[PDB]
RNA sequence: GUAACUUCGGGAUAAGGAUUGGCUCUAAGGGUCGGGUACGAUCAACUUAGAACUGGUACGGACAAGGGGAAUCUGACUGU
RNA sequence: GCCCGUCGCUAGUACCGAUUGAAUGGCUUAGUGAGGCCUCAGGAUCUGCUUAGAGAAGGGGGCAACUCCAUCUCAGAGCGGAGAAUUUGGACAAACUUGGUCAUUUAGAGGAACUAAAAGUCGUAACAAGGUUUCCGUAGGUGAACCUGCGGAAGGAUCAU
RNA sequence: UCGGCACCUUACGAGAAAUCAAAGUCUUUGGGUUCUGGGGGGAGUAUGGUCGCAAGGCUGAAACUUAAAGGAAUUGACGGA
RNA sequence: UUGGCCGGUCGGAUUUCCAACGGGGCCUUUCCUUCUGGCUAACCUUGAGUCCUUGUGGCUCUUGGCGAACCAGGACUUUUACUUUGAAAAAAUUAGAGUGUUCAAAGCAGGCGUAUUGCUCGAAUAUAUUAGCAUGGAAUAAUAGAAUAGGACGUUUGGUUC
RNA sequence: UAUCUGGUUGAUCCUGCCAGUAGUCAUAUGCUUGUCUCAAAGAUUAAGCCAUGCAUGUCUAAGUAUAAGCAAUUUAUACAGUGAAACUGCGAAUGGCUCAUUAAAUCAGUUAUCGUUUAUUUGAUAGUUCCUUUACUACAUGGUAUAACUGUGGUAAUUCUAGAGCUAAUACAUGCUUAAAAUCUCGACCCUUUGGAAGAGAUGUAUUUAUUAGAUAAAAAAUCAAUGUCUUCGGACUCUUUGAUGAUUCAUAAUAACUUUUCGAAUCGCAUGGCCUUGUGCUGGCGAUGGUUCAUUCAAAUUUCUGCCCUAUCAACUUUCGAUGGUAGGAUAGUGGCCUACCAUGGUUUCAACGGGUAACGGGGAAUAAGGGUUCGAUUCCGGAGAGGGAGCCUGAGAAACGGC
């Protein structure tokens, strides 16, 4: 997200307290702030060499990942910088001594470091309430192949 | 609700005070103080239920209002004063110095000490952090703030507090092979120093401990209190040294000394 | 916002209920002009939505312009 | 022998039913909209200074360097504070009125049933080849059990040319 | 020999029996899965929805009433067998 | 771990004398993702000497010693379910140890002298599910991997960033 | 304590319910009732209505006493003991009672606050107070303005109060004295330049903003603003302070300021020491009570994951009066559609959403039980809600409080 409309907004989108001194020409021309969220969750390079803002990003923004870390499959990417993921599980009734498929849907903030899509298993980490519903931010995207290189039109 | 509660229901008390179910509807609520409500021991519980000096809670008032008890060298005339772990309790008359330590059952021992050991105490370092004007301070398990420590003192260690001037005399580092007093849960009152410490970056660090009889027992790090080197405790240990004799062994000893 | 009933086309503008001026603005919505064997001059129209301010709370300001509902009989209807 | 109905006696239970039937609870388009809060004002009072005008009171080193903190009778051009009633605008919003809608409860002349139920009257539809083999779906007809057409089944009165 | 419609004999088994190589491998109870039933009536009724031009179809009660209704076989009795 | 036999303690320590369970390692073609620096390996390597009366049960300043007998970073991570173990799990209640409330329901008391300067035991533990955390297993039940090879392995090119 | 038995028939064997049987910490009711222990008790129906009385007040040597109170002092002519009243402070936000709402809501276990507030407790913590210093004001100690009270009154009546006059503070409002150095900024007094200086101010802590530091893989070098403080004028300079967390724009510290400038003791009891300029001079102990911040403790708020009864004669719900998200603001104690403005079209559902019922508060738990289950839980503990219904608010750390408005 180095390019392609960082500023499309009524307010000026910038990181808080990151002063770009205009006199001193240091050969980066925009200081960028990042952190690691902890717990082995790497800071992706497209956050470092990308130039999105995302005040709710776990790396470049002002949210701290702490609490539960969950995993789930992305089902819906039709908001802006937010997804809902499906947490499928089995629930056990003791009378039948058997299990039932339940699920809960969890809306998760996606940083614009990642390029998620539906059907992607993804690692999400708890934060403060981002929205009315969102409490989790994507800390790691666990899609590897997706079986999509063997399906298109052939000679 | 609407704010802080002032009452403790009996049978909502912490169980390790051994309060009888009947003969009174209410428990002594621990006041605000150095130790938590469920980790403390009010002076009325000490002076009437553990020492049997007072019959009522009114004679606990008649003792504290003659400047008799002193916790950590200071009198503390509160009846429900929350004296907790490692607290030295001095009685001037009777000349008795006690140190509130856990017996192996998970309760509070009626454990006398002497004056050179009553002159100090131990405190587990809760946090190390710079205070204002840059002054470093360390926080102990009884909430004491002591400024300018040794820079080697980190969290989960133990410092020896001089208790007259509340000064760090020396400190026991938290490392392998050093006497761990487990201070919470079902393992409450168990010693044994180490196996190792497992990290769990994310929360709830766990510490493996194996006592004199080589019984390993895993405990969370937040229940760990370091009280010395291998052997050589920095305080007098209670009558039983925190070994956890099982009930088969416990029935074996009591029959071994009831026929003399 | 809108019922019963219905031949499912209607009933229906059902019933009910808010708004409407003036002024100063804002926002959309066009046409003609152009490329290398990361571009805006130019003109024109009245619709719609929004905002503020304003006033003896007036505002479809004259004019113009459905009263409505629940039932019964009777002829299906338009027409004569 | 058993058994089916029609009709009739008594008693009970629900169902439809004119009555825009009634009652409680909502919930909601709308209209009015208290009160407190915040806010635009307000300024009865109830004060502390101080005056360039008599305010009958030295300019706080001193009555020659346009430089040294300075108060009574009243209007005050100098201020400054506290400030009650009242008021504007909001936002929260009780409550009232009206309509829509939902759900529960309750009244109803009367109609259409079921049961107690074995007993009355009429026929005998089923059970025997029950005297027209029975039953099922459908249609039409009959005081009525039913009858009749069409197709089915055998739980048939035929396991068989 | 493969597959099918059946049948015959026996009954290891099954069932209350009539019977059944499936209706067996079931208190020595678990191969997988769908639908249905919970004493008889009221009643496939009322109401509501839904489908159909309608006849009606699908879904589908409760109040109330009842001590038996039913299944299979035995012996009799009776048959305009 | 049953014990297991000097029965010498008038049928009462003991032990490879063993068999069956229960684990841990090593090798047989056998993952243990990984380079760093504090371990200096049950010392892969045994200068110097075995004053004990014969064995395969009892040692030193060592020839730079797989610096790999755990502490914090990655060229670092296919995910579950299941099950074991453990924390953390309020008490009361329930199960349940102790204890003559005279018994018992209960309660958490109590017990013992020299009762004169008083001694002392307790107030256990299990279960407390399902979810969450750590943990050992890797059968069973899934899931994923290399087929248009955009495959895996390579300690001694470092390009537009770092 | 893994048990069945009576009832269909002339008789049999079944399906099958009816009936018996036994508990109930499960209610009512009938009959009867001597002892001892133990003890639920207006939940159901009406969270319907309430007469009366009580249920929340509080004083130590340690805030304020001229009672015209009492005792009657202990150089005690400021007071000295006791103390009604009243002011001040604190409490009244706990308890207790009830279960009406409330079906992912509460609640239970389990996370989070790196998303915040917090009286009290406990531990620490404050030499700077000078407006613009070369325009300081009692600090051996500032002011008015009031209660109680005296006295005069209104009303049938209230825990009503009016006008006048007194008087205190730990109430209210002002306001100083407790070093010394550094380091910046300004600054009358640098000739042929790697050429300074008395003085003058500021620098505690709160506030609010901006900027900086809060570090790190081990070692080597020759050029170009740079002789970057390389000394026989090139005898290559021999050199890193920085806490914590898994993770930060954390703790902390610094620079420039900003503020209807917060705090930095005009307070009280007891004991009256010691020293030499004997002046009632200077230092002086143990406390009490206030106070700023940071931790602690009691909490509070919101929060992750998972779990609740029946119904599809409830299949589509939410989005004009936020629905789901983004961006910014406002508000908050803070996160956040919490609200507002603009923009996008989301979010949920046959794995039962949305809706309807509940004589539904949730849990610990209780009754029955071979095992599995079934049913209850208003109710001695814990969490929630409510004080007739709603709504709003003051005070206070804490209430949308009801023995407050
Ligand atoms: Mg949002
Ligand atoms: Mg309460
Ligand atoms: Mg109209
Ligand atoms: Mg009409
Ligand atoms: Mg006509
Ligand atoms: Mg005609
Ligand atoms: Mg006609
Ligand atoms: Mg006509
Ligand atoms: Mg006949
Ligand atoms: Mg016939
Ligand atoms: Mg026949
Ligand atoms: Mg039949
Ligand atoms: Mg064949
Ligand atoms: Mg039935
Ligand atoms: Mg049906
Ligand atoms: Mg119908
Ligand atoms: Mg017993
Ligand atoms: Mg029965
Ligand atoms: Mg007697
Ligand atoms: Mg009642
Ligand atoms: Mg009750
Ligand atoms: Mg009730
Ligand atoms: Mg009442
Ligand atoms: Mg006193
Ligand atoms: Mg009570
Ligand atoms: Mg207090
Ligand atoms: Mg005081
Ligand atoms: Mg936003
Ligand atoms: Mg935002
Ligand atoms: Mg915002
Ligand atoms: Mg209820
Ligand atoms: Mg419950
Ligand atoms: Mg309950
Ligand atoms: Mg309340
Ligand atoms: Mg208060
Ligand atoms: Mg209220
Ligand atoms: Mg109350
Ligand atoms: Mg009340």
The DSSP call for residue B48 is I
Q: How many angstroms separate the CA atoms of A140 and A110, rounded?
A: 10
Q: How many angstroms separate the CA atoms of A116 and A133, rounded?
A: 20
Number of H helices, E strands in chain B: 4, 20
- As given in the structure block, the two tokens for residue B15 are 């169980």
Contacts of B127 (CB under 8 A, 6+ apart): B138, B139, B155
- As given in the structure block, the two tokens for residue B151 are 């820079």
- As given in the structure block, the two tokens for residue B220 are 């969370």
User: How do A136-141 and A98-109 pair as beta strands?
Assistant: parallel
Query: Stated in angstroms, how far is A28 CA from D49 C1'?
Result: 64
Ramachandran angles phi, psi of A98, nearest 5°: -140, 170
Provide the CA B161 distance to its chain's centre, in angstroms: 14
**SS3 annotation, chain A:** CCCCCCCCCCCCCCCCCCCCCCCCCCCCCCCCCCCCCCCCCCCCHHHHCCCCCCCCCCCCCCCCCCCCEEEEEEEECCCCCEEEEEEEEEEEECCCCEEEEEEEEEEEECCCCCCCCCCCEEEEEECCCCCCCCCEEEEEECCCCCCCCCCCCCC
Rounded (10°) CA dihedral B109, B114, B115, B120:
-50
Q: How far is CA A112 from CA A2, A56, A108, A138, B4, in A?
A: 11, 10, 13, 10, 45
CB B178 within 8 A of CB B226: yes
Q: How many angstroms separate the CA atoms of B100 and A36, rounded?
A: 44
SS3 B38: helix
Rounded (10°) CA dihedral B153, B157, B160, B161:
80
Sheet containing B121-130: order of strands: B145-147, B136-140, B121-130, B158-161, B168-172
Which one of B199, B200, B201, B202 would you mutate to disrupt binding with A, by most A Cβ within 10 Å of its Cβ?
A: B202
Q: How many angstroms separate the CA atoms of A52 and A86, rounded?
A: 27
Closest C-alpha among B54, B108, B61, B113 to residue B88? B113
- As given in the structure block, the two tokens for residue B188 are 């409450």
Q: How many angstroms separate the CA atoms of B102 and B39, rounded?
A: 11
- Decide: CB of A140 under 7 A of nucleic strand G: no
- As given in the structure block, the two tokens for residue B42 are 């009010």
- As given in the structure block, the two tokens for residue B69 are 């008890």
Q: Looking at chain B, which residue has its C-alpha nearest residue A65? A: B202
Q: Which helix (H) or strand (E) holds B129?
A: strand B121-130
The DSSP call for residue B45 is I
Looking up tokens 């002032």 gives: B6
Sign of the torsion angle spanned by Cα atoms B119, B58, B80, B9: positive
Please give the resolution of this entry in Å, rounded to 1 decimal.
3.0
Inform me whether the C-beta atom of residue B20 falls under 8 Å from chain A C-beta atoms.
no
Per-chain residues with Cβ under 5 A from ion ligand 1: A 131
Q: Which helix (H) or strand (E) holds B220?
A: strand B216-220
Contacts of A57 (CB under 8 A, 6+ apart): A47, A63, A111, A112, A113, A137
Q: How many angstroms separate the CA atoms of B258 and B235, rounded?
A: 31
Q: How far is A67 from chain B (nearest CA, A)?
A: 8
Query: Stated in angstroms, how far is A94 CA from G309 C1'?
Result: 17
Q: How many angstroms separate the CA atoms of A88 and A119, rounded?
A: 13
CB A59 within 8 A of CB A43: yes
Q: Looking at chain A, which residue has its C-alpha nearest residue B204? A: A67
Provide the CA B103 distance to its chain's centre, in angstroms: 10
Q: How many angstroms separate the CA atoms of A15 and B44, rounded?
A: 57
Closest C-alpha among B38, B47, B30, B121 to residue B82? B30
């Amino acid at each position: 997200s180095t390019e392609l409309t960082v500023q499309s907004e009524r307010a000026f989108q910038k990181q808080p307290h990151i002063f770009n001194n205009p006199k001193v020409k240091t050969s980066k021309r925009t200081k960028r702030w990042y952190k690691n969220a902890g717990l082995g969750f790497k800071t992706p390079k497209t956050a470092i060499e990308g130039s999105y803002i995302d005040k709710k990003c776990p790396f470049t923004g002002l949210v701290s990942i702490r609490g539960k870390i969950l995993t789930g499959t992305v089902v819906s990417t039709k908001m802006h910088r937010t997804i809902v993921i499906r947490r499928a599980y089995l629930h056990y009734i003791p009378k039948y001594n058997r299990y039932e498929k339940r699920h809960k849907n969890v809306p998760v903030h996606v940083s614009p470091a990642f390029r998620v899509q539906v059907g992607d298993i993804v690692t999400v980490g708890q934060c403060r309430p981002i929205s009315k519903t969102v409490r989790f931010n994507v800390v790691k995207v666990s899609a590897a192949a997706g079986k999509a290189n063997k399906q298109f039109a052939k000679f | 609700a609407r704010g802080p509660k002032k009452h403790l229901k009996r049978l909502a008390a912490p169980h390790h005070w051994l309060l009888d179910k009947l003969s009174g509807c209410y428990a002594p609520r621990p006041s605000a103080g150095p130790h938590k409500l469920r980790e403390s021991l009010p002076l009325i519980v000490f002076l009437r239920n553990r020492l049997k000096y007072a019959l009522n809670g009114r004679e606990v008032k008649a003792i504290l209002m003659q400047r008799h008890v002193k916790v950590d060298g200071k009198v503390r005339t509160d009846t429900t004063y929350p004296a907790g772990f490692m607290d030295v309790i001095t009685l001037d008359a009777t000349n008795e110095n006690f140190r509130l330590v856990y017996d192996v059952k998970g309760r509070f021992a009626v454990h006398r000490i002497t004056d050179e050991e009553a002159s100090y105490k131990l405190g587990k370092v809760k946090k190390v952090q710079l205070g204002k004007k840059g002054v470093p301070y360390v926080v102990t398990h009884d909430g004491r703030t002591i400024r300018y420590p040794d820079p080697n003192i980190k969290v989960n260690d133990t410092v020896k507090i001089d208790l007259a001037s509340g000064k760090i005399t020396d400190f026991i580092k938290f490392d392998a092979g050093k006497l761990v007093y487990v201070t919470g849960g079902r393992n409450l009152g168990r010693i044994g120093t180490i196996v190792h410490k497992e990290r769990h970056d994310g929360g709830f660090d766990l510490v493996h401990i194996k006592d004199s009889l080589d019984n390993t027992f895993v405990t969370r790090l937040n229940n760990v209190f370091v009280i010395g080197e291998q052997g050589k405790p920095y305080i007098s240990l209670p009558k039983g040294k925190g070994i956890k004799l099982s009930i088969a062994e416990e029935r074996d000893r009591r029959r071994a000394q009831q026929g003399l």
